[PDB]
Design an enzyme around this catalytic site. Structure first.
Site, PDB file in Angstrom:
ATOM      1  N   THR A 159      23.468   9.367  47.286  1.00 46.73           N
ATOM      2  CA  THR A 159      24.421   9.536  46.197  1.00 46.73           C
ATOM      3  C   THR A 159      25.464  10.584  46.566  1.00 46.73           C
ATOM      4  OG1 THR A 159      22.759   8.938  44.533  1.00 46.73           O
ATOM      5  CG2 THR A 159      24.708  10.112  43.758  1.00 46.73           C
TER       6      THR A 159
HETATM    7  C1  LIG Z   1      18.465   9.599  45.431  1.00 46.33           C
HETATM    8  O1  LIG Z   1      17.728   9.471  44.229  1.00 46.33           O
HETATM    9  C2  LIG Z   1      17.074   8.226  44.047  1.00 46.33           C
HETATM   10  C3  LIG Z   1      17.339   7.717  42.577  1.00 46.33           C
HETATM   11  N1  LIG Z   1      16.440   6.593  42.382  1.00 46.33           N
HETATM   12  C4  LIG Z   1      15.965   6.356  41.094  1.00 46.33           C
HETATM   13  O2  LIG Z   1      16.225   7.044  40.127  1.00 46.33           O
HETATM   14  C5  LIG Z   1      15.050   5.121  40.940  1.00 46.33           C
HETATM   15  C6  LIG Z   1      15.942   4.059  40.147  1.00 46.33           C
HETATM   16  C7  LIG Z   1      15.515   2.544  40.081  1.00 46.33           C
HETATM   17  O3  LIG Z   1      14.666   2.119  40.839  1.00 46.33           O
HETATM   18  N2  LIG Z   1      16.133   1.654  39.137  1.00 46.33           N
HETATM   19  C8  LIG Z   1      17.168   1.985  38.145  1.00 46.33           C
HETATM   20  C9  LIG Z   1      16.710   1.788  36.684  1.00 46.33           C
HETATM   21  C10 LIG Z   1      15.558   0.796  36.554  1.00 46.33           C
HETATM   22  C11 LIG Z   1      15.719  -0.315  37.581  1.00 46.33           C
HETATM   23  C12 LIG Z   1      15.753   0.211  39.039  1.00 46.33           C
HETATM   24  N3  LIG Z   1      13.720   5.412  40.307  1.00 46.33           N
HETATM   25  C13 LIG Z   1      12.613   6.142  40.935  1.00 46.33           C
HETATM   26  O4  LIG Z   1      12.743   6.564  42.066  1.00 46.33           O
HETATM   27  C14 LIG Z   1      11.247   6.429  40.222  1.00 46.33           C
HETATM   28  C15 LIG Z   1      11.010   7.888  39.625  1.00 46.33           C
HETATM   29  C16 LIG Z   1       9.564   8.350  39.324  1.00 46.33           C
HETATM   30  C17 LIG Z   1       9.274   9.688  39.043  1.00 46.33           C
HETATM   31  C18 LIG Z   1       7.983  10.152  38.769  1.00 46.33           C
HETATM   32  C19 LIG Z   1       6.897   9.285  38.758  1.00 46.33           C
HETATM   33  C20 LIG Z   1       7.145   7.941  39.032  1.00 46.33           C
HETATM   34  C21 LIG Z   1       8.444   7.487  39.308  1.00 46.33           C
HETATM   35  C22 LIG Z   1      18.860   7.251  42.521  1.00 46.33           C
HETATM   36  O5  LIG Z   1      19.239   6.254  43.094  1.00 46.33           O
HETATM   37  N4  LIG Z   1      19.753   8.034  41.751  1.00 46.33           N
HETATM   38  C23 LIG Z   1      21.191   7.637  41.631  1.00 46.33           C
HETATM   39  C24 LIG Z   1      21.775   7.543  40.230  1.00 46.33           C
HETATM   40  C25 LIG Z   1      22.525   8.586  39.742  1.00 46.33           C
HETATM   41  C26 LIG Z   1      23.071   8.527  38.427  1.00 46.33           C
HETATM   42  C27 LIG Z   1      22.843   7.433  37.644  1.00 46.33           C
HETATM   43  C28 LIG Z   1      22.062   6.336  38.107  1.00 46.33           C
HETATM   44  C29 LIG Z   1      21.807   5.189  37.301  1.00 46.33           C
HETATM   45  C30 LIG Z   1      21.058   4.132  37.747  1.00 46.33           C
HETATM   46  C31 LIG Z   1      20.510   4.172  39.054  1.00 46.33           C
HETATM   47  C32 LIG Z   1      20.743   5.272  39.843  1.00 46.33           C
HETATM   48  C33 LIG Z   1      21.513   6.388  39.416  1.00 46.33           C
END
Ligand SMILES: COC[C@H](NC(=O)[C@H](CC(=O)N1CCCCC1)NC(=O)CCc1ccccc1)C(=O)NCc1cccc2ccccc12
Ligand SMILES: COC[C@H](NC(=O)[C@H](CC(=O)N1CCCCC1)NC(=O)CCc1ccccc1)C(=O)NCc1cccc2ccccc12
Ligand SMILES: COC[C@H](NC(=O)[C@H](CC(=O)N1CCCCC1)NC(=O)CCc1ccccc1)C(=O)NCc1cccc2ccccc12
Ligand SMILES: COC[C@H](NC(=O)[C@H](CC(=O)N1CCCCC1)NC(=O)CCc1ccccc1)C(=O)NCc1cccc2ccccc12
Lengths: 222, 218, 217, 219, 222, 217, 223, 223
Positions: free
Chosen positions: G1
């Site tokens: 990001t």
């Molecule tokens: C580098 O950081 C990784 C982060 N990844 C995540 O946040 C991903 C996102 C994802 O898989 N999905 C988006 C919504 C639902 C469908 C698929 N969840 C996860 O990594 C799981 C978190 C977790 C924490 C503690 C226990 C268990 C699990 C990311 O990409 N963050 C970037 C980001 C920033 C602002 C707004 C956003 C909105 C949507 C998606 C991403 C966004």
């Protein structure tokens, strides 16, 4: 980070560098670490930036709060006690990495001798406090270099101006041996900030004077 | 219902009618607070915030409670947001809410009347604001002056005829003490303070003793 | 019991009858709020949510308490669900519930009268909604106009024989100030705001100073 | 207490009498709710659960409070046990308890009158059930129709003769509006009409609004 | 477990396998993982069975609760928000093994274009959500096989029937490469469950049709 | 409401009138407290803080409650800030607040009258401060002397005619006992204490027995 | 990001990539990370998606809440303070992996001169804040690449369009060196999102403009 | 421990062994693990003895409690939901070693077809539940062996009697391969306990019936 404070005849001075780091990376060049907390008191803080700024701001707010409620400012001992209680209150987060140490410089209008009205108080992480009788004090990652420099340079302090130059030079030595303390940036024109306090109150030292003093030090060392 | 409220309103109105009078009027340099106060350490006018001042008439412990509560509100808000977000309108509004609650629910209503005044920040050109909060939480915003406590009508009329906008400090003081007389003062019977729009941060300042005597001679 | 409620109701009704009057009427561009308000800084009309506005008559601190409660309710509901689930019917309903409880259980009833208005969302085609809630929690759904505070009968009558659907902004304003007269009414004694169905998100918009003076002449 | 409870009962009764009237009657397709209601969006008739509907007369905020509480009770009981365990007898019972407690202990009694109606589940042969709860928690089990609010005697008389438990929707509606008219002195703009439709698969409650209701009215 | 959902012109489809396991042992063959939560919404959940079923039930009850209380159903954004808040609420127990991820498929009656009014929302364990603007999405231990299959087969989706075929085939590939996902049991006659949603609402697809599709797929692969 | 507050004020006023008299007056060495007290161990004058003393007239348990509350307030302030931040103005102010709350909200108002006196710290030239707090929270700032309890008028007038701003300890005591009379009170019916501005830290000291007898002769 | 923000004469610009990842797997291509929090402020957030979106939403609701209650929006310093308090409030959960860092770009209507009335504030996980006086700032796993690119490209910024170019290019370099930041997807037509804020308020840059700029960058680096 | 339940035309049968163990030591020979919870439902429970008995007792009390309060018994779905909620409530103590899994057999009086009104529902430690259509189910340390035996013997179930015999035989195989399951004690005359449920309710199978079937099985396996 390095904050210095020293007494001169009839007043006190405090100066601080401008550098903010995250580990090895430089995350700030114009940072202000010395604040005027009230008409006769200034605070410089070292440690975690967030906690430090919250300390300075909240502390000034507390002092002015008491002043408006009770119609008179706190005695200097009262100010010391409240700052100490704040540090002691932060001890828990400090153990978790949000550590912040303050250094307090003031001019006590209720003091007996208007020349011995200067006050410098240092603190530890448990809110221990010390009123310095030896004239100078420092806090931060470069405080040992700054204090050891002032140990040699303090005899040159005879008025409100020689004290400023000894302070700026101590900050220069701190930056010379400590990478977390920032020295004079002649390319960008960024110099340490200073506050001087005498019977007329607490005033910000203008940047141009610190600039000329720093250039004098640099050309003296070349 | 109506009888209890009649009695509360009546108690508060009589209590305020028995107390000394206070005047707050806008002048060229900010806002002037003049209050009949023979005491030498007990206050009817106080600083609230940087550009916000407070004046009260009535029972001391009550309007002092309100004074401290206002200082708490202002300092807490300025900390939570910023010093520039604290306004005279906010403090007046909160005083209206609080005095409403006191008048309706406390064991005895507060025999107090409040004035919240605000001047412009340093270097800004903004007209002063005067707010009047009454014992039941009723609030009004006056443009020129506010009179509270005692027999107000003669003082209000005296000011109505003798008040001029953008008057000098001495002029406004003389007019204020004159209007207070009709309802011989001097430094020993007065508490005077001013919201000084020409000060960089804290606008509130007291005028006492020799300085006040100088302004009174004129 | 009977006399306590009688006395509460009478205190409230006298309190409202003693306060300045407010009128809100639907026009071609949304909803218009006109209120007798001499204050520079005190407001009887306010924004509640994106397409929902609020007008009140009576004791200031009390209907302002109700205003803040309505804003709090609306913002919380928009956060918990979505901004589109917040409706004027909801705010009116909660105001009815709240004013009922206040009237029945508070130390002194609230001397207030409320109007909650809703215009359509941008591009959506929906007739405006006007709601009137009285001091005892009674709620009514008006189709054309709402009058609150002071002596209403002459103002309501004035509107009944001079209001037309889909009037222009200037026409609706002139009709509103006219109906207010029946009971100087220039820019210095008026507070005017509008829920503008033509705005993309926040429909609440104030008409003040030189602009309002222009609209009056 | 001899007079405090008398005053409360009188306040509630008078409050209900000064309000518009509501009728609920069983017909061949389930249960019909007709209420004099000028509002476009403020409802006096509501769904409670799959086969259970709610009608009220009196002060809006109060019977709306009771409506919301009933929906809460029904949904909670269906979650804790099963949807098939929620019955009209249950909602009527909790309404009796609740209105009793309100009438005795609340600052002011509730000026409301309630009707809880239940039709059979899809495919089950079972006659509709009508329950009537009054401002003091009194509960009664009515067999044909329930009238609440205003002057009920003319409406009850009008219904009592010339009534058909197996009337058509249009027929039952026109009889209902007739009985409502006997308590006057209507149309789509003055009526709120809803039905517990025993022929619907799960949620039996549905509203009859606008042009469709006009169709049922004018012929 | 594998739950698939894809958009077709004027509607949406969601399908799920029938297998329940405890480690390597098969503990269920007729399990249902896709539920009709609303007149226009369907939910499929993967993870701990207890948590999944309780999620579906409580969610449907929540939606109908709001509908009866406020006299109008929630907007689709509101439904998304409530499901997300539910998952985020479960995060704590999920960290201890009571994990459940939902996949939401719906038809937005308030959409401007009824041909693109289909909605597919995926979630993570922290209640993060995504409205899919790509046509398909899947959840569960076989969801990557299903997504990669639909990536190739999606161009064939032109109506409800072709979409249902592509969905069942994606489940077939998932079960082919994931032992925790169950394929069509031709011996017992147990097939994936499916829900299709258009302007007429959400209805469960009869098992006979899904079986027909399964045999078409199998014969196509031989 | 009004009736209840009138009755309360009357109960407290009668209670104070029926009680013994106390005088506190500023003299060259600080502040002098003289009180009619037949007891041997129940004290009406007490130390509050380093330079702050306390005198009361009325019902013992009540003004003793206030005495203890004042000690608690003063010690708490001195700990939270510093001993030099505790002032007579503060104790008087808090006593006004407290008696206001008691007068309006307690089951029975307190039949007490209070005097808070402060002398300068060692080595400082600050004129003494006298504060008078009455049963309803009214607070007054007296410049020379305060009289409380019983019929005060003759004593207040007597001190008005006989007071000397810089009198000696013996002189001031004689004036105080003189004004108190206007049986034959002496070193058995008196409780006398002084805030002695010449003490280094704790200024409160009692004058009892042989020393007091010396002071009267 | 990667989220970037830079000051241009009389305004500010903020841009963000579109990639959502779970470890190495790409779980999103059209994700939005820059939001218009109020008429004159936009916030871009990095970290856990759930926490980031919840931050943006709750923050916008908070600002509009104060505006409607007190009849005037918060001072810019007030907005900074509230965002900082929010982050500081999340610190505990951040220690367990629910970390979210915001970057704030706004237009201060109360500034003494509409030149340099743009504001850029960066934060740390403890809610430390910094108002940038050097014109640009970035946050996220590619923030160092983007900041180092803007260090060279910032001298080219003279108006809104040149600033938008430098922003999109900094995002391009970030995606060039960081796999967690997504570059322009010319096959799908998915490009970074941008918001530009001047005295007339905050507006979304249409996808078209960003696309044209992206192809300009690509062709400049190609031929 | 082994609890079996199987459906037969027009009814259901549930049986359980009689052995109580503490590790390798036998601490019980006459233990009863299958209980009649209401006129039309019976539950057999495996795991910690204290928790199992408390489950059976508390469950019967809950069902009859609802019946007396509301004047009608719970629907079968309601009964299932309450048992599941009970297990989920015990999850915490189960994680600490106080685990108990129930197996429920009932006759749904509200079912459409009386010949298939039998119901068998199994649970997991989180209170997950499954209504079995396979026809049979088992729980306990020998449940694998008993289920695998019933997989072969179920086609022989044609009435209540053949179902009873198949149940006792499944328990016999369970005891044959699991030392924690007790077989028929011909010296002491202790045999599994069984409950059979039809439209007329739930009744305890007498010891003479189960004893006869057991001796028939033993002689059949002994030649
Ligand atoms: C580098 O950081 C990784 C982060 N990844 C995540 O946040 C991903 C996102 C994802 O898989 N999905 C988006 C919504 C639902 C469908 C698929 N969840 C996860 O990594 C799981 C978190 C977790 C924490 C503690 C226990 C268990 C699990 C990311 O990409 N963050 C970037 C980001 C920033 C602002 C707004 C956003 C909105 C949507 C998606 C991403 C966004
Ligand atoms: C010894 O430690 C170095 C310290 N640096 C820090 O504290 C840097 C400063 C920084 O990167 N930024 C300033 C705020 C806006 C973003 C950029 N953050 C950090 O170290 C992050 C702390 C953290 C990590 C993980 C979980 C919780 C907390 C420092 O410079 N301290 C000196 C200092 C003293 C008084 C006021 C200041 C104000 C700003 C910056 C510095 C200040
Ligand atoms: C986590 O992936 C494996 C999961 N397996 C499980 O959840 C199995 C299911 C199972 O054995 N039974 C179903 C209920 C009746 C008895 C048999 N329990 C378990 O693994 C035990 C959970 C646990 C043990 C100890 C402490 C805490 C938790 C599964 O299949 N999940 C798929 C699934 C999705 C939606 C609805 C469902 C409903 C029923 C069964 C499965 C369902
Ligand atoms: C875990 O699988 C073995 C289990 N054994 C146990 O539960 C035995 C039972 C037992 O020794 N006695 C029954 C009571 C009187 C004395 C003899 N306790 C134990 O093994 C120890 C329990 C424990 C260990 C650590 C911390 C806390 C508790 C068992 O046999 N379970 C079978 C069973 C099912 C339904 C009802 C029953 C009733 C009585 C006995 C058994 C029953």
């Amino acid at each position: 980070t390095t904050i210095v404070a020293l007494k001169y005849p009839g007043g006190v001075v405090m100066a601080g560098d401008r550098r903010s780091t995250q580990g090895n990376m430089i995350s700030g060049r114009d940072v202000r670490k010395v604040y005027i907390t009230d008409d006769y008191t200034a605070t410089g803080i070292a440690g975690t930036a967030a906690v430090a700024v919250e300390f300075a701001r909240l502390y000034a707010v507390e002092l002015e709060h008491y002043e408006k409620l009770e119609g008179v400012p706190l005695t200097f001992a009262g100010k010391i006690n409240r700052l100490a209680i704040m540090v002691r209150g932060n001890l828990a987060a400090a153990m978790q990495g949000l550590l912040a140490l303050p250094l307090l410089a003031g001019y006590d209008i209720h003091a007996s001798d208007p020349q011995s009205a200067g006050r410098i108080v240092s603190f530890d992480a448990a809110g221990g406090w010390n009123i310095e009788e030896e004239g100078y004090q420092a806090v931060g990652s470069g405080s040992l270099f700054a204090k050891s420099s002032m140990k040699k340079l303090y005899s040159q302090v005879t008025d409100g101006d020689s004290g400023l130059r000894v302070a700026v030079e101590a900050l220069y030595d701190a930056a010379d041996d400590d990478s977390a303390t920032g020295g004079p940036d002649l390319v960008r024109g960024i110099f340490p900030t200073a506050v001087i306090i005498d019977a007329d109150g607490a005033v910000d030292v203008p940047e141009s004077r610190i600039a000329e003093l720093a250039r004098a030090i640099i050309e003296s060392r070349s | 219902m109506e009888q209890a409220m009649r009695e509360r309103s009546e108690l508060a109105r009589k209590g305020i009618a028995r107390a000394k009078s206070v005047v707050a009027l806008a002048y060229a340099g900010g806002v002037l607070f003049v209050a009949e106060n023979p005491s030498r350490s007990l206050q009817k006018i106080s600083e609230l915030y940087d550009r916000v001042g407070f004046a009260a008439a009535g029972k001391f412990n009550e309007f002092d409670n309100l004074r401290r509560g206002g200082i708490q509100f202002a300092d807490t808000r300025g900390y939570a947001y910023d010093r520039r977000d604290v306004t005279g309108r906010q403090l007046a509004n909160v005083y209206a809410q609080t005095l409403g609650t006191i008048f309706t629910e406390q064991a005895k209503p507060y025999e107090v009347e409040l004035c919240v005044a605000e001047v412009a920040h340093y270097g800004e050109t903004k007209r002063p604001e005067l707010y009047r909060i009454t014992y039941d939480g009723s609030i009004a915003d006056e443009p020129h002056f506010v009179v509270m406590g005692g027999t107000t009508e003669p003082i209000a009329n005296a000011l109505k005829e003798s008040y001029a906008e953008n008057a000098s400090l001495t002029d406004a003081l003389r007019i204020a003490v004159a209007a207070l007389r009709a309802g011989t003062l001097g430094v020993a019977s007065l508490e005077v303070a001013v919201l000084d729009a020409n000060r960089p941060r804290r606008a509130f300042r007291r005028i006492t003793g020799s300085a006040l005597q100088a302004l009174l001679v004129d």
